[PDB]
Design a protein around this motif. Structure first.
Motif, mmCIF file in Angstrom:
data_model
loop_
_atom_site.group_PDB
_atom_site.id
_atom_site.type_symbol
_atom_site.label_atom_id
_atom_site.label_comp_id
_atom_site.label_asym_id
_atom_site.label_seq_id
_atom_site.Cartn_x
_atom_site.Cartn_y
_atom_site.Cartn_z
ATOM 1 N N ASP A 412 51.182 39.459 47.522
ATOM 2 C CA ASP A 412 50.017 39.806 46.475
ATOM 3 C C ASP A 412 48.943 38.667 46.356
ATOM 4 O O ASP A 412 49.202 37.584 46.774
ATOM 5 C CB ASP A 412 50.685 39.990 45.174
ATOM 6 N N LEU A 413 47.856 39.212 45.819
ATOM 7 C CA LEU A 413 46.369 38.374 45.762
ATOM 8 C C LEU A 413 46.017 39.160 44.427
ATOM 9 O O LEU A 413 45.532 40.278 44.423
ATOM 10 C CB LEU A 413 45.622 38.460 47.001
ATOM 11 N N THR A 414 46.239 38.615 43.199
ATOM 12 C CA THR A 414 45.694 39.068 41.981
ATOM 13 C C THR A 414 44.622 38.068 41.454
ATOM 14 O O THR A 414 44.772 37.014 41.206
ATOM 15 C CB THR A 414 46.767 39.353 41.110
ATOM 16 N N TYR A 415 43.244 38.609 41.451
ATOM 17 C CA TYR A 415 41.935 37.748 41.198
ATOM 18 C C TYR A 415 41.831 37.225 39.858
ATOM 19 O O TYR A 415 41.141 36.323 39.589
ATOM 20 C CB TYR A 415 40.696 38.923 41.496
ATOM 21 N N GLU A 416 42.530 37.848 38.729
ATOM 22 C CA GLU A 416 42.576 37.342 37.380
ATOM 23 C C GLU A 416 43.459 36.093 37.335
ATOM 24 O O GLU A 416 43.445 35.275 36.633
ATOM 25 C CB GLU A 416 43.178 38.417 36.392
ATOM 26 N N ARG A 417 44.618 36.186 38.027
ATOM 27 C CA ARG A 417 45.686 34.979 38.380
ATOM 28 C C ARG A 417 45.195 34.074 39.111
ATOM 29 O O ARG A 417 45.313 32.655 38.864
ATOM 30 C CB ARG A 417 47.080 35.430 38.880
ATOM 31 N N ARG A 418 44.329 34.202 40.234
ATOM 32 C CA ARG A 418 43.756 33.308 41.373
ATOM 33 C C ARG A 418 42.654 32.637 41.116
ATOM 34 O O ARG A 418 42.403 31.516 41.542
ATOM 35 C CB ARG A 418 43.674 34.199 42.702
ATOM 36 N N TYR A 419 41.724 33.515 40.361
ATOM 37 C CA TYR A 419 40.200 32.827 40.080
ATOM 38 C C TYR A 419 40.092 32.658 38.702
ATOM 39 O O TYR A 419 40.443 33.595 37.895
ATOM 40 C CB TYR A 419 39.250 33.694 40.903
ATOM 41 N N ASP A 420 39.047 31.683 38.267
ATOM 42 C CA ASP A 420 38.564 31.459 36.862
ATOM 43 C C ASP A 420 37.403 32.329 36.617
ATOM 44 O O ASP A 420 36.882 32.377 35.447
ATOM 45 C CB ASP A 420 38.474 29.865 36.824
ATOM 46 N N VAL A 421 36.702 32.571 37.644
ATOM 47 C CA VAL A 421 35.623 33.408 37.484
ATOM 48 C C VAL A 421 35.349 34.663 36.796
ATOM 49 O O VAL A 421 36.105 35.636 37.207
ATOM 50 C CB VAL A 421 34.796 33.671 39.060
ATOM 51 N N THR A 422 34.461 34.751 35.771
ATOM 52 C CA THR A 422 34.150 35.950 34.854
ATOM 53 C C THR A 422 33.367 36.895 35.804
ATOM 54 O O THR A 422 32.222 36.727 35.762
ATOM 55 C CB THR A 422 33.680 35.885 33.778
ATOM 56 N N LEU A 423 33.981 37.761 36.686
ATOM 57 C CA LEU A 423 33.233 38.723 37.726
ATOM 58 C C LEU A 423 31.914 39.583 37.176
ATOM 59 O O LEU A 423 31.971 39.702 35.788
ATOM 60 C CB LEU A 423 34.291 39.731 38.247
ATOM 61 N N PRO A 424 30.969 39.871 37.880
ATOM 62 C CA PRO A 424 29.835 40.429 37.585
ATOM 63 C C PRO A 424 30.074 42.052 37.611
ATOM 64 O O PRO A 424 30.804 42.395 38.336
ATOM 65 C CB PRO A 424 28.701 39.972 38.354
ATOM 66 N N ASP A 425 29.279 42.606 36.613
ATOM 67 C CA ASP A 425 29.159 44.343 36.510
ATOM 68 C C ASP A 425 28.570 44.587 37.791
ATOM 69 O O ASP A 425 27.761 43.668 38.476
ATOM 70 C CB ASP A 425 28.521 44.727 35.313
ATOM 71 N N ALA A 426 28.964 45.715 38.369
ATOM 72 C CA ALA A 426 28.261 46.365 39.566
ATOM 73 C C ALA A 426 26.794 46.250 39.591
ATOM 74 O O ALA A 426 26.175 46.092 40.752
ATOM 75 C CB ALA A 426 28.813 47.866 39.720
ATOM 76 N N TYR A 427 26.324 46.483 38.295
ATOM 77 C CA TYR A 427 24.818 46.452 38.350
ATOM 78 C C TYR A 427 24.105 45.127 38.245
ATOM 79 O O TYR A 427 23.077 45.039 38.697
ATOM 80 C CB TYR A 427 24.370 47.418 37.058
ATOM 81 N N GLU A 428 24.734 44.162 38.161
ATOM 82 C CA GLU A 428 24.156 42.731 38.156
ATOM 83 C C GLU A 428 24.031 42.419 39.849
ATOM 84 O O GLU A 428 22.912 42.152 40.028
ATOM 85 C CB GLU A 428 25.128 41.801 37.631
ATOM 86 N N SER A 429 25.093 42.762 40.489
ATOM 87 C CA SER A 429 24.956 42.487 41.828
ATOM 88 C C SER A 429 23.880 43.374 42.602
ATOM 89 O O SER A 429 22.684 42.601 43.420
ATOM 90 C CB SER A 429 26.329 42.838 42.648
ATOM 91 N N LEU A 430 23.824 44.662 42.455
ATOM 92 C CA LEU A 430 22.985 45.567 42.797
ATOM 93 C C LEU A 430 21.599 45.329 42.496
ATOM 94 O O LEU A 430 20.734 45.308 43.538
ATOM 95 C CB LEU A 430 23.215 47.145 42.520
ATOM 96 N N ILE A 431 21.087 44.945 41.280
ATOM 97 C CA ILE A 431 19.909 44.798 40.626
ATOM 98 C C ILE A 431 19.340 43.321 41.431
ATOM 99 O O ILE A 431 18.352 43.309 42.004
ATOM 100 C CB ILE A 431 19.645 44.671 39.250
ATOM 101 N N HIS A 432 20.236 42.536 41.455
ATOM 102 C CA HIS A 432 19.874 41.164 42.427
ATOM 103 C C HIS A 432 19.735 41.392 43.901
ATOM 104 O O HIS A 432 18.540 41.040 44.047
ATOM 105 C CB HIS A 432 21.275 40.355 42.241
#
Ligand SMILES: [Cl-]
Ligand SMILES: [Cl-]
Ligand SMILES: [Cl-]
Ligand SMILES: [Cl-]
Ligand SMILES: [Cl-]
Ligand SMILES: [Cl-]
Ligand SMILES: [Cl-]
Ligand SMILES: [Cl-]
Ligand SMILES: [Cl-]
Ligand SMILES: [Cl-]
Ligand SMILES: [Cl-]
Ligand SMILES: [Cl-]
Ligand SMILES: [Cl-]
Ligand SMILES: [Cl-]
Ligand SMILES: [Cl-]
Ligand SMILES: [Cl-]
Ligand SMILES: [Cl-]
Ligand SMILES: [Cl-]
Ligand SMILES: [Cl-]
Ligand SMILES: [Cl-]
Ligand SMILES: [Cl-]
Ligand SMILES: [Cl-]
Ligand SMILES: [Cl-]
Lengths: 494, 487, 490, 494
Positions: A412-432
């Motif tokens: 396993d690799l669980t992103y909430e357990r592995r990383y401290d980063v508050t992930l962006p919404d799909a629309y943040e990425s796309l607009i950027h």
């Protein structure tokens, strides 16, 4: 606790002004997804210090500052860290009542854009304009003609980009006419057709998982893969605003766009480079080899009332016409006619009013017949895009201890357990990406055609009343016929 | 929870060399755990046989023996009951009179059995010094054997199994008329480690590893053994053995056989052991030019003294406490794949792991990616993890290295058994798969004997390294040049 | 002669202008190929073949009957059509630098186009530039300036012959000089190897068959060898060669085309740009040839004296270090070809005439060991166009014992087809507007990038040029280099 | 033209006397196949100068010299090169009348052999005795008991090898009983179970083709192979002797033995070495993984009279019982349950009274879908074991010339056109290997069990009248149902 916003805008957006125009600012999508994403990008310091966010709709506004503070700001999310920036960000937003068909109202919008562009203290004269079209589809071509006619920048004084939202027609013919209606209005380069799945952290990692690693590269073909499943599950129904859905269905809403994007990324060949054109050329290429979904190879459902009565039936909605056979659920078996995917079954699932909220990809490998037989079962690579972001490989290993037997385990690799980063919404990425002029995660004109060609024969059969739509209780797993179809299609459950 | 086969007939486990350091530290503790697990019958007879003329056996059992038992916070109430099963006997390893005395006692225990079958099964654990081995084997075979059709006789045999091909072959020939191969259980405790026992499942129960396990996908295979401890006090024994004869020839070659073997015809013992011999017979003998040797000096501060500072160690000894070798497997699955075998004492950390390093995916990521790696760590903390490249999470299009991890201490509540619990159990269950076969042993010595002889002739250079360091600097350059890409 | 003329060639006039008609290439390769396409009925019967050259010849009819017709080949089957075809050829003395002469050319083409009895009023122009490289840009500027067909009245296609520069910089220069003159679409850069029957079959062999498709990568292939051998030396034309060398003459163009077709990925379709995109793609991943990984030769006189030494030629400058031979190890830096050595061989004055491709597969170590040897797929493009796969089989009879055998396909044994010349195919394809077997601007750049660092090291006197007797196999150092590079023989 | 015979006997046979006893010398198999093969082995100089060929049978003799000259010598083949040696070879043959059940006559057989063994002028005393059992199956165990009881050589004075001919039972149970009846009589090493297909040039080359070459090694698995076909065709019927065939059928006669040997060599894993037991261990291993043939996955035929009348119907034979449903034709689909052959269909065909004489192996590879599509077709590896021994790979190539189309071609190897060698009969090889003590091309006790286990459930269903036996005209291609079954099974026609 409240902290300063850096001046981290991309240097390609620094030299000239920036005007982000949200057409349809009154709409549900703008209030729930666009303005919140802009707020996060502003807080990240990814937009200039002096951006101009211009809302434009038919809605009359008595108090734009009350709308901004009460309505708009209500949908903003990290308010325990960024609540202090709400005021500063909202100070950047302005509103404008205007029609979607009258030229003077479009001359007004451009004159305001020129007025904001002249206010710029930076080096280059002119300005870069990004238009977010969050409008109902009956006004789309009206707006596009109006914006192209006289809301465009002067030549060699800044780029003009258009973010366009679904629906993109209802089948191949209606989509093709819309693409032809837009061809003389704008260049393909300026059109940014949004499909928000291409902005999800786990969908954006498909291409890396597959082509940066020999472990997945060597295994990603008919010799090792037995079955590929793409799943979309929602606990929520299609209530209140269910008449809007009746005209669409689950295939047109989720399967044609969202899950076909995942299908294209999972099935494409290795790109010539990581350029937008090189990636999208492989996406079109595979989609052009998907045999059109056949009515015999599918299962459809429409939700009835929940066992207790909490969630009402699909037909209980007054917006929904009497005796509607609109599917709220669909499972399809798809075939990709090429030498990598010959014989590999593709199972695409999407349904509303189900047992859980789910978005995952399941790459199920062939069994290793000998020497373990029944002591083993198909390995599977599971990429779960939501609720909790995880990637895990299901394998067989010896039962730990003094007992000489086998058991199923996971790497396993669980992103909430592995990383401290508050992930962006799909629309943040796309607009950027749209501000950075990166087209790779945006539906191309031909990529869109290729998608509709897979589902139109099926959609038409459905609309002619040729495919049976089975009932299922809201909150249940869907029709029982669907699990038997999945089994018979090639997917061995665990 | 005893095997139904073990229920029917008497069971006598004879520990020859009961006074020895291996018996007290590893054998008796493992027997206690099997007894506690209910895997041994309640009326089991554990007979210690050694040269020690000890007076108080009850004090030896309570103070000395019981001191090495481990789960005493969970199953330490059973100490008394288990120790009630153990008996001791002073005897010689060369006099027939002392083995006649042994057969006499085992018979007086077998006759006491209240079960169905009137005979009695015998398992002999030979934890003896190698100078008395053939003496004991001849004595046991001559008159300590069980009558025909009245119970099996099984012999657990401990290392050393010679010092090279010729000395080992000698010993195998000396044992051939004494016992049949089926009766012989040659112990290599690595074949009892939870991560070593999982190699065969990882490889042949899964298509993900099966498809990838060959020269087309694998670039480099590394086997590592690291110890922080030196030849602490007992350097005079080690001096005669060296790191290759101690760790590499036996332990790490077992890991090498399980990692490189073909898929077995079935999960039977001979079908598995036939594939082990088969691959070992295709390993090109290690060449002196393709190796690096070390001997530890005193630590940077002075805590750990130098190898030669030990008075047990002869003056001017060129004994290697460290070795890195590159091995080639001459078959169609492994052609061109380099095998890097590492073993050293007085290093930076305690480690036992396997590293399968896959080929780089050149395009489209180039420098934005690096070789995938399947790492199996057997100790300090039983883990299996696959190293991959993924997009840096968030609002950035860059890559980073990640892992799909499985950590046994985190995932499971199971308090894993010692390597000797498994093997002793398997020997009682008559399962030979995790025991060195006569031919499997020959095949192992054939890989290292040309190298061992070159070393003993003073043909290979033995480089110094500070205790606690990573070993000679020449070793990392050799590893790099051999094919293994560092991170 | 049948009416097997394509319908696009029919409606509009057709004027094939051969610029440099007095040239050796024109009489030996161009005019004979045109005769065969006319005889095959692939050319309109009212075609206008216009020879344009600096030669001030008196008797064109004698040149056409004696000189030109002498090089025509199937005269036992098509000798009667010689007269009719030659009746279509006209000649025109003119310069390659004066606008008045190109205007005179434009004038003539227009008179010919006006004579057409077909439906359309315009006319299609194909220009074959068989000129010395010092006049190339002069002609191109002149033709573009005023020898072009009016808009919406017919296409203008330009067939261009090698040399395409001498390295990356000189070639890039020439491509930039042509960019404002013509659209790449109109430019047909000839490399005649792309017209050879065995070179045209590479793409089919490779991507229409699972047997070769499954095996075509580093897991199964151990070595790839491309060979060019010639018994002929410079023999008269040594000064003509001295400035080019074997790498610039054969390796950079011809054998790199074979390299691109053997190493490319599977195309998205059989379209020209889909094929040419895969060719550019692989060539862009070939690591530039390094001087340490090569062997060079220059032929001396033959053991007996029959063939004189390279330096015995008076056209050849004194003390010239020009290589008449080269063997090179090339590396393709991608996941299909990682670790696979590519050995490219080209030499003059050798033991035999040869052009073949050798794909040597990895050995099957067990259970046969020494009783077996690497399989090999050999594609021989000439002397006898064939394809054979070398394998190990049991010795027939009451023995066992293995032996080496072949699963052969010999084109002169199996087919009654009398194959067309390389120039028939390509000229035809240019009339049919098919660009797939023509060097693309970027495909050319990618080729020069592989050899320029090496060509420069050679020109600086950094690479040793070993002697070899004419008629021998070349320097002994070359065979050892081939062995050490990865290739095994028996 | 007549020439001297060399002394090319294997050195291991030189030292001690050699007695080849042909039990059932009056038999059709001995006069048609055994004695002719011995003559060729004698002519090749592969047998000692002083061999003793002893014919033993029930048939009273009136003139052995006339039987030898007229009957026996009539079946000898290279008489334009070896006609002169006929006399010398026949001088080595002797005949003996006796029963297959009375000890009395086995004492006589032992008495004559010792007499011949005592005549030896070589170094070692005693003698090597090879027994060729060409008897009817009702006398088999009788002979074996008699030979074992008192026709065996003294210990440490020469080997005793037994060549045993089919039938080896009629199913698993009857075969198992025969193997158990022979277990106390002889060691497995001394028994040489003949299957003459293992002596055919092209069958003996399977193992070399497959494991000495990377081209076939890399391709020999489910990733590249789509279908495998094994074909046996005969123009001849059960003319005159149908009574014996009726009891056997086409599956028991050809498919269970001959074509399953070809199946084992085509499907086995790579052997640990080229030793007999290393090869025979891989043959048993794969046969133990063939799923037993199922009645639903097969087509059966029984020939009727030919279109004109030349060849009469199967049932027209008076030896054939009235209303017999014995199959003279069979096509089966077989599945090998292992990771190399998972999903690959095996088509096994055998029939009498067909259009042609054929024995070939067809390895059909997967299609290459793109970029050629319809312009290409499945490659195939064809190994034709008879009438003409050729091996050829079928491929796609560009049509030679101006024409830019594709065509099907072959990379051929024809043995009559590439070698000058007058190939040996299957029985020459096999008899030789038996003298050289090489067991690799001889059916092992367990290899035999594994073969019967594949066909017994099917044979029993057939015998219970559960499987339909379709008619077909003699000389035709067989029932039309068979070609449709082949198509549906996975084999794409030429
Ligand atoms: Cl209701
Ligand atoms: Cl969520
Ligand atoms: Cl995790
Ligand atoms: Cl339709
Ligand atoms: Cl070997
Ligand atoms: Cl991590
Ligand atoms: Cl974990
Ligand atoms: Cl053994
Ligand atoms: Cl040695
Ligand atoms: Cl590059
Ligand atoms: Cl030629
Ligand atoms: Cl040959
Ligand atoms: Cl031929
Ligand atoms: Cl340079
Ligand atoms: Cl006598
Ligand atoms: Cl014997
Ligand atoms: Cl038998
Ligand atoms: Cl087996
Ligand atoms: Cl099985
Ligand atoms: Cl024949
Ligand atoms: Cl041939
Ligand atoms: Cl067996
Ligand atoms: Cl049955």
């Amino acid at each position: 606790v409240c902290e300063r916003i850096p001046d981290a805008v991309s240097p390609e957006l620094r030299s000239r002004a920036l005007t982000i125009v949200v057409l349809g600012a009154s709409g549900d999508l703008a209030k729930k997804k666009t303005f919140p994403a802009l707020f996060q990008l502003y807080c990240n310091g990814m937009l200039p210090r002096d951006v101009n966010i211009l809302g434009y709709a038919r809605s009359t506004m008595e108090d734009v500052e009350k709308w901004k503070k009460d309505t708009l700001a209500g949908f903003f999310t990290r308010l325990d860290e960024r609540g202090c920036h709400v005021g500063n960000f909202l100070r950047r937003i302005s509103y404008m009542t205007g029609s979607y068909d009258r030229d003077e109202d479009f001359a007004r919008l451009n004159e305001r854009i020129l007025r904001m562009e002249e206010a710029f203290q930076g080096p280059e004269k002119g300005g870069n304009r990004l238009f977010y079209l969050a409008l109902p589809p009956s006004v789309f071509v009206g707006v596009c003609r109006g914006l192209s006619k006289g809301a465009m920048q002067k030549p060699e004084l800044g780029w003009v980009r258009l973010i366009v939202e679904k629906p993109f027609g209802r089948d191949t013919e209606t989509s093709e006419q819309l693409s032809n209606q837009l061809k003389p209005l704008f260049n393909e380069r300026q059109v940014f057709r949004i499909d928000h799945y291409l902005g999800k952290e786990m969908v954006q990692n498909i291409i890396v998982t597959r082509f940066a690693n020999r472990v997945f590269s060597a295994l990603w073909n008919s010799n090792s893969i037995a079955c590929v499943q793409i799943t979309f599950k929602e606990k929520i129904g299609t209530e209140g605003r269910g008449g809007y859905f009746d005209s669409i269905g689950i295939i047109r809403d989720v399967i044609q766009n969202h899950l076909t994007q995942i299908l294209s990324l999972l099935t494409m060949e290795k790109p010539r480079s990581l350029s937008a054109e090189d990636i999208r050329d492989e996406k079109v290429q595979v989609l052009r080899q998907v045999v059109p979904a056949n009515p015999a190879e599918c299962v459809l459902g429409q939700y009835t009332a929940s066992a207790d009565g909490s969630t009402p039936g699909y037909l209980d909605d007054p917006s929904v016409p009497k005796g509607s056979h609109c599917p709220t659920f669909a499972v399809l078996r798809l075939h990709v006619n090429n030498d990598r995917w010959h014989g590999v079954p593709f199972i695409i699932r999407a349904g509303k009013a189900l047992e859980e909220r789910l978005l995952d990809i399941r790459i199920q490998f062939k069994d290793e017949i000998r020497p373990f037989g029944e002591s083993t079962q198909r390995n599977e690579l599971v990429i779960r895009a939501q609720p909790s972001e995880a990637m895990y490989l299901k394998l067989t290993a010896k039962t730990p201890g003094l007992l000489n037997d086998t058991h199923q385990t996971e790497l396993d690799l669980t992103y909430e357990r592995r990383y401290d980063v508050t992930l962006p919404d799909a629309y943040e990425s796309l607009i950027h990406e749209a501000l950075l002029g990166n087209s790779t995660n945006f539906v191309r004109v031909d990529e869109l055609d290729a998608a509709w060609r897979i589902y139109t024969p099926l959609l038409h059969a459905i609309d002619r009343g040729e495919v049976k739509v089975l009932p299922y209780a809201a909150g249940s797993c869907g029709p029982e016929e669907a699990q038997e179809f999945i089994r018979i299609s090639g997917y061995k459950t665990t």
